[PDB]
């Protein structure tokens, strides 16, 4: 039933007695469900160390992975550019999923087209799909450039992106001078971040490879910034703001910040802002190129060093205090501009926040996961805060990254209990947070189910989730946050300390039992 | 607005297309005539999307894993192939269920073989066998395994049927290979059909010789209800209050044992004709069970469908149906009295997948709220024959609408409200037109039955009349 | 006992069995405690509407007030000025409490001195205290200005601040040209915001009243901004940023932003930033003066209109969308500067967030409290978001402000169930949230105990607290947040929608009972 | 640092002051002589603060309401006067208790008469009576009312004693008027004395003629422990494990009935001599109960104090004391083994109130940690006589230190760690010197007893050796 004054959505409508009896009758009569005691026994078993051993013996089964496929990152990178239509050569279902994924994370329109390859193409290729799709996309949505990635179908059948685009231009489907960069983004290689890397390198090679004769390093007195796969608009904004404060001329290549934050003003803008073609053309004239996320920008690094002759500085992700300091000092040395008083003041206020909150942060144990550069920045900032990252997980990280983060942990006494896992998924992490319980998790929305499972064991075993990363689906507008620089470190510190404080408040809210420690002042 | 105005609208929108795309898309746009009872003479459907036109359609994997097989809770559904499709479809669709996740129910979990380069080069059959063994070791309470193929599985010549059969014989467990690779077909609809054939061939006929189930002449099975936000539960409550026994749900909150028990029912109540009319027809053929299409969207339609369902049984069921209608009449009458004045005479454009484009028009009109345009992502011509009788005269009909086409249609028609998916929501919100997600109920619901209709009216009122729509234009512009 | 590997603080140390038995023996043997059934019955009675009627019949007893005393606001205002020492004429315990209060809220040093009046001064007066304190403060802390407020002791004994300061200057205790503005800030009139108003008006009268001869309105082509009692640094920052983007010359009067966010760089700065004396001297030459919080800046408004001859615009607090729009349009017409594309884009982005989140925000019921301007801005934004403010409480509000907020509620259909209470405290609100349960509370840290009490009735009766306002003691660095302008509205919207989503996630976390609605995507 | 260097430091800090302030403050700074057993010949204390010098001391209301009376849980403490004092003191001090807040315990609530202008001009006595009536109506389970006076009460001629007496006779309830107006005295210490007199005169004697309490020769009371973060509980656990019966706690987690039962104990264990030595002396005089000062800060001090307390009873108590010491020796030995190397030989300056400046030196030295400077906010000369012995040679002693004085002392001495209140924490953290709040244990604790010492060592290690202190200087400066 329903009351017109107080209408109930699914929760708590289905907690009604009549719905309860209906569901119980359905379960008993026809579901043939396992007895509740067997279910409880199996769950308790899944919380154990023996189950953790069996879990970590997994070789072919992946449960709840913490990564996506390359063309998603390619689509994001392509959205970074001005009036650019991401165009994924392959099957339409992939584009539908990419668009919905980014729609849910960013809560914004995501424009991406497919050539809608079908079983007919599976034996004949997507060449005609390429010609028709390029022509239709240009005529219909009028992009200034079309950035082409691939789905795993096109990668498997072996579609020659370069030949297909060239034949499209030759036959007159698309103008010969229309920029159509391309990158092969195989979904069975790496993760979404290497798709971003591949897309960016393809666009840079399209716009710079054939015109390196007139390029002089430093002639435009600018620094190139390649952000990598980034889903926090605040990170783009903070990098631009920090470089503007220093008076450093910069070119932010693949800047999707404008198109992912378009105003709702009565019209829909399919394109907005983004890196111009002129900026990409003039990029080899910069003083240097700085990669914000080096651990997934390898291909871009090799292209920039080998072709633009840029001596790319060995910089960690500008996260935390020491690494942001290194970023600012390197920028100051490359550009010759001194670090302004505003950035020094920002650093001092971040340090003040650390001093203010260190007692609550000290000793807290964390499980965390995400992309490699983000994870290692989180680990470094955690070590700077006196926290103990006990479980570090990067499903798409590699052994070099693992050695780097192990070296980072070995330089601090707060990394002694730390362990780094690569190639493991969130089911492995569920086992880890059961057998070696941390105080909190830091990760994306997929961690919520883990927090569910721990709560099922008991309130005293619950590991609350702190939502930092990608994707975040069950909270609104967190994509506007910042994680880079002093500002991002301040945001992360505030989130962490206040998560600790809200957990403590919940634990001490029981009157006459635990509320003796329900302090007003913390 | 006149039919000629809509015709000129269609031509004007089509003008910007290349000639081939223009002539193709001309066949997918029509002006509704409710008198006509045929579609092939008015519209074309179930056809390939034009490349590069930003089609909203998905793939066969979405229509099979995400739609039919996925909701089945006590089964473990392996997204066989690279990590992407399973990751994007993990808990994206709100097919609600009761269970202990990771123990006896696995709907919102992403089981995948996580294909790497070596899996593509050498194949994944050995990986699939080892994955099945690890699944049994780590999830011993699962009541069956389904293997949903992704594009490379059918592209690299993987033999998942043999792996399924061998590991099923060895493990004494039902393992269903579903060749739902995303390149097959043109949309999710072929996913519906392939998943239906998988259910028919691997699961349905396992209790054919089992007579231990106590059957009654009041046995019905809900077919093609996926419990979106609890829709199937809100329909089953009314089915059982009418005195019938709902033996199975297909497939929202659906157990595999329910599917195996379906051939024992007396009436199949097919809600989504598009996705499970195939299994309904096969059940009618082989097992003799008659099926009928039914509609629980809005009070008028649910009353009519309840009476129709009760007319297929004896007089006790008819009396129970009248009692149910009498007890639920005040609820939807009060809902209508509260919400009709704020929604009366407001034009809606809908673009949902294959059953909700039609089949919710009655729910809109029960609040006095007209529909001026409708469209299908992946429907067949039978869907359109059922659509014309329900759509009003001189309304717009679009099959596989493009992003630009939808944009232009909304720009000229200027509907009061739009109902579509997540890939249109923010586009149309930025234009100031209130938007309701009609796939996920905007994380609300259910919308089936009388309780679902109350929720439906509340949500439509909350979004249509929200203050935020009087604010998109800055006062200084 | 304690284990060296895992040392327990009070929680959960006192949950140990031996401590439990010790506490039980203490309670039974000597505490003479009421039986638990009596306590439960009394509490249940306190949750009823009959108890609510008795509670609202209160005429003399105040329980858990939502306000402070005037000299606190005077100290904040004084801290707003450059190299200025707040100097409270009265007893030292007041200054200790003000400094502790602001230290806990801001987590920063708060510099304030007292002349440490004692029982000897209770009959003679604070003249000698004034002279000695002024001399010692100037000689020891070297302020450029001393802003003098009063404690209730000095107000009761009738200390003449003006005569005391003049006599101190005449006898060489302090230089004659040393600025010593004064304001009487009785703790038994109004609240802390009244003290801020009084202090600001006293400083403005000190620096402008005698030099109005050479003042021409608009001669400096600037707009004066008086922020009022403000404890969010982001509010000062956002007002300055918005006026800077508009190209509008402005003078922020009483700007404590720098001194309350000094960097931790190895030295302690007792003074930093602040409104210069030249700025306050030149303020009458501005185009106009805009009061950000008019409902507690009455005295300042009368001084500015009557003496500076500025026609102060009738503007609401720039909170929400409509009121921020009105603020920007008024600034545009006063300064002649058009609203830039950046601010219009910010407005469109806030509107986009509203459209994105309205479904979760719609119909949600709120209880809220705080200072009048902040509360009325919160109510306006809530009505803009489709939320239903059910209980609006302003302990220090008045009937004029009540009529204004009732008028605002009457314009929207979401204010029909709203009720506005003035002169009521947090115990009244406890009764209100029991008898007419809202979905959430928005208020300062003192609300946590209310959330405690509701949870004691049951989880289904718990009203979670959303911490917006002053003071915030149990969370860290929330004082850095923003509440004004589009940026502040975005922050408030994010906080509200994510609080709703966090509560729903908690309610649907029980596996096999409520987790059918534990949606990944919201 | 040599004694001559300390004297030069004192002069080179004092020269900034005007002559009168210089000569006054010169009496409040000293170089500690551990060979001198008198304070009047070395330092001056309990004197008025110099105006305008940013003294850290509070008022009599803070020492009475916030300190002594406030912790008593089952009483309702009315902050009589304007809203400010009660609001700032509400739940500022972590005097922990067990109870149902708002029902049977009221420690963290702010009861106030919220004085307005009319209350100031006309008096608040009848307002106080009506407030008491409303308190009884709305909080019927309260076991007594205390009325803590704020400055206007003493300045406007309010007769709260008459109101308390009359309403107590009418209501048959203990109503205690406390004349703790902030202008009285020079600091919180006179608040201690006035609150002690209030306890003695209005509460203590109510069970003088009552013999229903079963007394034992093992009866002790804890006097001057305020359960800061649970300190009193961590002391009482050790007291009762020694076989003793702790009848009362004064006043952390203390009930009014426990206070009324205190005259029946055999030994008063005075922890904070400064705040409750008055009531201890009165109890010794009128009731004959001997009292002794005791110290539970750190292992050496708590072992010595436990042995001293056991020496005042028979041999069973001494044997129980030895058993307790043996059982707790491994715990504090393991704490020392874990934390001594990280804190060994590290200099600390302390500025706390009346007891913890001394009385915690042993806890620091048990971790191999030297105290080079110490000072009192509001101590008397007896406090300094007890301070000289515990302080090492050539250490700095400061009474009522000014903000500038503390700043300069820390600047030259450069201590490894500072222990003081919240009004110094951020000042000294900005200079890069690790800070420990020694009033509230930085929202940690307890620090009393062996468990408290483990917490003390952990907190000292966490703050002293925090990485954040190697970061205040930017690398480019
Ligand atoms: S199954 Fe089909 S697209 Fe019939 S694939 Fe799709 S939960 Fe739609 S119009 Mo999402 S043929 Fe169901 C559908 Fe309709 S996922 Fe749901 S709303 S009634
Ligand atoms: S049409 Fe459909 S969703 Fe597309 S792949 Fe094919 S089954 Fe799957 Fe998959 S991993 Fe990523 S998302 Fe693709 S590129 Fe492959
Ligand atoms: S020394 Fe002590 S704290 Fe000061 S007033 Fe006096 S008892 Fe109280 Fe009170 S309301 Fe505010 S804080 Fe004062 S000015 Fe009066
Ligand atoms: Fe700080
Ligand atoms: Fe949006």
XYZ file of N, CA and C in Angstrom, chain A residues 381-449:
207
model
N 51.471 11.150 1.136
C 50.826 12.109 2.025
C 50.439 11.461 3.349
N 50.000 10.201 3.309
C 49.683 9.479 4.537
C 50.913 9.341 5.422
N 52.059 9.008 4.824
C 53.295 8.922 5.592
C 53.696 10.284 6.142
N 53.468 11.348 5.368
C 53.749 12.692 5.859
C 52.845 13.062 7.027
N 51.637 12.511 7.069
C 50.673 12.822 8.116
C 50.845 11.963 9.362
N 51.804 11.043 9.369
C 51.954 10.119 10.471
C 50.995 8.952 10.456
N 50.182 8.814 9.413
C 49.277 7.686 9.293
C 50.024 6.467 8.774
N 49.424 5.302 8.977
C 50.045 4.034 8.602
C 49.232 3.365 7.506
N 49.627 3.483 6.249
C 48.918 2.746 5.198
C 49.221 1.263 5.295
N 48.286 0.475 5.814
C 48.588 -0.937 6.012
C 48.362 -1.721 4.729
N 47.297 -1.417 3.995
C 46.993 -2.118 2.755
C 46.991 -1.115 1.613
N 47.916 -1.283 0.675
C 47.990 -0.446 -0.512
C 47.732 -1.358 -1.695
N 46.735 -1.029 -2.508
C 46.334 -1.890 -3.609
C 46.248 -1.068 -4.883
N 46.894 -1.546 -5.938
C 46.774 -0.928 -7.255
C 46.550 -2.059 -8.247
N 45.305 -2.206 -8.700
C 44.970 -3.327 -9.569
C 45.686 -3.222 -10.908
N 45.933 -2.004 -11.383
C 46.608 -1.798 -12.656
C 48.062 -1.361 -12.501
N 48.616 -1.412 -11.289
C 50.008 -1.063 -11.101
C 50.946 -2.183 -11.508
N 52.226 -1.846 -11.630
C 53.238 -2.803 -12.065
C 54.334 -2.934 -11.007
N 55.334 -3.762 -11.322
C 56.389 -4.067 -10.359
C 57.331 -2.890 -10.150
N 57.601 -2.106 -11.196
C 58.417 -0.906 -11.028
C 57.748 0.078 -10.078
N 56.450 0.310 -10.280
C 55.688 1.164 -9.379
C 55.673 0.594 -7.967
N 55.564 -0.731 -7.849
C 55.602 -1.370 -6.538
C 56.940 -1.142 -5.849
N 58.040 -1.254 -6.593
C 59.354 -1.006 -6.013
C 59.493 0.446 -5.582
N 58.970 1.371 -6.388
C 59.020 2.783 -6.022
C 58.250 3.048 -4.733
N 57.039 2.497 -4.622
C 56.247 2.754 -3.422
C 56.834 2.025 -2.215
N 57.452 0.860 -2.422
C 58.143 0.188 -1.327
C 59.321 1.018 -0.837
N 60.057 1.638 -1.761
C 61.135 2.537 -1.366
C 60.596 3.734 -0.594
N 59.459 4.281 -1.029
C 58.854 5.407 -0.319
C 58.461 5.000 1.097
N 57.869 3.814 1.246
C 57.473 3.341 2.569
C 58.678 3.043 3.453
N 59.779 2.573 2.865
C 60.963 2.230 3.644
C 61.679 3.455 4.191
N 61.398 4.640 3.654
C 62.016 5.868 4.135
C 61.297 6.460 5.338
N 60.189 5.863 5.771
C 59.435 6.367 6.902
C 59.149 5.241 7.885
N 59.170 5.525 9.191
C 58.808 4.491 10.173
C 57.324 4.173 10.206
N 56.497 4.906 9.466
C 55.069 4.636 9.395
C 54.699 3.707 8.248
N 55.670 3.270 7.453
C 55.450 2.291 6.413
C 55.919 0.890 6.740
N 56.320 0.624 7.987
C 56.885 -0.680 8.323
C 55.845 -1.789 8.210
N 54.620 -1.532 8.666
C 53.542 -2.507 8.564
C 52.845 -2.477 7.210
N 53.286 -1.615 6.300
C 52.636 -1.471 5.008
C 52.947 -2.648 4.096
N 51.967 -3.005 3.272
C 52.172 -3.955 2.191
C 51.497 -3.419 0.939
N 52.177 -3.585 -0.194
C 51.715 -3.123 -1.495
C 51.347 -4.336 -2.335
N 50.156 -4.298 -2.923
C 49.626 -5.361 -3.760
C 49.321 -4.787 -5.133
N 49.749 -5.488 -6.172
C 49.448 -5.111 -7.544
C 48.799 -6.302 -8.231
N 47.872 -6.011 -9.137
C 47.118 -7.048 -9.804
C 46.000 -7.652 -8.986
N 45.749 -7.146 -7.784
C 44.691 -7.642 -6.918
C 43.457 -6.760 -7.040
N 42.300 -7.352 -6.774
C 41.024 -6.673 -6.920
C 40.419 -6.396 -5.547
N 39.192 -5.875 -5.549
C 38.543 -5.484 -4.305
C 38.074 -6.675 -3.477
N 37.985 -7.872 -4.060
C 37.712 -9.053 -3.242
C 38.937 -9.438 -2.415
N 40.126 -9.360 -3.022
C 41.363 -9.492 -2.262
C 41.412 -8.480 -1.126
N 41.038 -7.232 -1.412
C 41.055 -6.205 -0.380
C 40.013 -6.468 0.694
N 38.873 -7.051 0.325
C 37.880 -7.430 1.324
C 38.456 -8.463 2.286
N 39.156 -9.462 1.744
C 39.848 -10.420 2.605
C 40.875 -9.723 3.490
N 41.637 -8.787 2.919
C 42.673 -8.094 3.681
C 42.083 -7.285 4.829
N 41.004 -6.544 4.567
C 40.407 -5.717 5.603
C 39.644 -6.558 6.612
N 39.352 -7.820 6.291
C 38.834 -8.711 7.324
C 39.953 -9.258 8.209
N 41.006 -9.816 7.603
C 42.021 -10.526 8.381
C 42.987 -9.582 9.091
N 43.350 -8.471 8.459
C 44.215 -7.456 9.057
C 43.459 -6.136 8.972
N 42.613 -5.886 9.955
C 41.627 -4.822 9.841
C 42.280 -3.450 9.915
N 42.114 -2.603 8.908
C 42.516 -1.203 9.024
C 41.410 -0.383 9.678
N 41.740 0.874 9.967
C 40.744 1.779 10.528
C 39.778 2.285 9.465
N 40.262 2.508 8.244
C 39.443 3.091 7.193
C 39.910 2.584 5.841
N 39.031 2.715 4.856
C 39.375 2.517 3.459
C 39.324 3.855 2.737
N 40.247 4.057 1.803
C 40.190 5.179 0.876
C 40.121 4.607 -0.532
N 39.049 4.914 -1.246
C 38.888 4.381 -2.585
C 37.610 4.882 -3.220
N 37.246 4.249 -4.331
C 36.101 4.686 -5.120
C 34.815 4.070 -4.562
N 33.700 4.277 -5.270
C 32.394 3.888 -4.745
C 32.251 2.378 -4.615
N 33.003 1.610 -5.406
C 32.928 0.157 -5.321
C 33.323 -0.357 -3.945
N 34.021 0.458 -3.151
C 34.370 0.062 -1.802
C 33.192 -0.025 -0.859
N 32.060 0.597 -1.210
C 30.922 0.618 -0.296
C 30.470 -0.796 0.050
N 30.436 -1.687 -0.942
C 30.031 -3.063 -0.685
C 30.966 -3.727 0.315
